[PDB]
Design a protein around this ligand. Sequence first.
Ligand SMILES: CCCCCCCCCCCCCC(=O)O
Ligand SMILES: CCCCCCCCCCCCCC(=O)O
Ligand SMILES: [Co+2]
Ligand SMILES: [Co+2]
Ligand SMILES: [Co+2]
Ligand SMILES: [Co+2]
Lengths: 314, 314
Amino acid sequence: MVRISIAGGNEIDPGSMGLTLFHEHLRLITEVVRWNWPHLYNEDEELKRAIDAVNAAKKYGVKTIIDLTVAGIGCDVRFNEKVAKATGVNIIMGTGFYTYTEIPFYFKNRGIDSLVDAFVHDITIGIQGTNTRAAFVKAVIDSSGLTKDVEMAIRAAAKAHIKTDVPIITHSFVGNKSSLDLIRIFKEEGVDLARTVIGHVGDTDDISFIEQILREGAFIGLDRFGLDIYLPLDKRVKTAIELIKRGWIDQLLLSHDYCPTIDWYPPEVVRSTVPDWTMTLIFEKVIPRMRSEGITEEQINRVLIDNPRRLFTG
Amino acid sequence: MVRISIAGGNEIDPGSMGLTLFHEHLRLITEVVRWNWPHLYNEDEELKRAIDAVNAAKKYGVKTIIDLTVAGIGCDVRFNEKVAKATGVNIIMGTGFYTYTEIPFYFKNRGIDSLVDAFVHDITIGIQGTNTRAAFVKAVIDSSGLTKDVEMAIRAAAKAHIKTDVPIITHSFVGNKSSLDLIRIFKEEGVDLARTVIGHVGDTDDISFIEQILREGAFIGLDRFGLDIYLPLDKRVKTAIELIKRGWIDQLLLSHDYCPTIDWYPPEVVRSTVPDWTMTLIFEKVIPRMRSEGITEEQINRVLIDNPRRLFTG
Ligand SMILES: CCCCCCCCCCCCCC(=O)O
Ligand SMILES: CCCCCCCCCCCCCC(=O)O
Ligand SMILES: [Co+2]
Ligand SMILES: [Co+2]
Ligand SMILES: [Co+2]
Ligand SMILES: [Co+2]
């Protein structure tokens, strides 16, 4: 019976997560830039935008949000504690190393075990000197594919899972075979695929490619609703309805991947280009369209409540 | 007439730097690792090792140390303020972005001007929310050569120099042509080479390669005395004596590049492999050997006092 730490250092367990967004962000920032140039940032605005987004989701029933911000994209327990105390929403945190190409010389010179030990420390003792412990581990691969450093960080995630039993939630890229690289590696390391999510699969509507992942037994992340560049909304909704009609409902997870702040781009170019991206679009637009095509209220609850719960049990 | 900020936010000017080590470190750490895994570090040990090293240099007459730790290797004004208040040694700080391959998506998505503006802010207003201002700018290239991101960061350093007139102190690699890449770029941007240091040239004893840099008019960094892997001590000393006998004394700068902490390696492997590396070796070993081969006390003073002073004037 698993105990899930939440920001603030209380615990809950899989059965009490309730209605959950399994992949979102509160603040996505680049550590080396914020450390060195704090004049480029405004902590009061960042906190306000995050509290606003999380309160909007809370209005539609969200009890638990899983924050996918790990090392390399600005993981910050203390910032998350403030969001949690202001909103009353449970925030689940994780560990891992986010990169598409390289890892730090710190870990290249010491090897895979030093990275595994850092993740195992966050999972068993606490993130960043706190008693909030990581409840999952992340692995990342994108359009550069499987570089050596990427392969190391993915295998480290797999090994931390093997030691601690926390699930693995991933980031992949549908424009190459990266999702299948993740599957191969996890199988080489003995990971039970039912404890993993292959991420960002919602970015494609190619049913045959999706089913080739689903046949391995993993969950899939239909997890960027609202980011149309990628795959427009109408195709994302259509794909989710079709996968449910074809029998796959127990392997589906939904989310928006919302970033109330993301430092990678100026904010104006993001607001102009994906103006519908929020942490509530699944409630305002996706779920009504699914219901009006015959998806049941219970089927929605299975996806948004049971599937996350089951990811975190077994 | 130039004002040089020092850690703590006092100012001095080139004439009062006095006996100077132009390239050293107080603490070299990886921001993303220390931000995310503070359990791997001990701030009290790091501070003590830095205060100890700086007091040892102070015993031999050092008044001013230039800290070459910039963004990407853990630049931290507040840590440096503590070292300064404890030791009474002037600490000069800089700006730039340290990398051998990639720069953050933050700057790739906004372009070279956003990096120039970050450096110009540190030089004219202050580093990290303080009134300690950067007094030089750094540019870096190593064994991967001139990647696109590296080229951007080098040109940004050149442009910040063109706006603000602070000197440029560089890191290069003698095993390829990187030193000459720096020279070409600085010339394309209109930089006066007498306001630059081509770094880590002391890692070679090939007189003909060194003179090809000296002929361009830049200073050179004979700046890793004590790191024998690279080029043993006896050859480094011999090269400095020969360059002075061949007429080059006004273009020579000496230092140890000492890191009281460096997170890239476990400490034991560093202590075992370069056991003589300290912030005092130039005083205990190099200068006596130079004097006993006929280098004058005034020639030593020209190198350790006038050359840094002149780097910072014009
Ligand atoms: C092309 C300029 C504006 C495009 C806006 C796209 C916003 C980028 C979304 C960030 C991708 C999600 C991050 C991640 O979770 O891995
Ligand atoms: C090969 C294992 C131990 C080797 C010890 C070498 C210590 C590395 C020195 C760091 C290089 C200077 C950093 C820099 O200033 O750019
Ligand atoms: Co992602
Ligand atoms: Co994400
Ligand atoms: Co260097
Ligand atoms: Co250095």
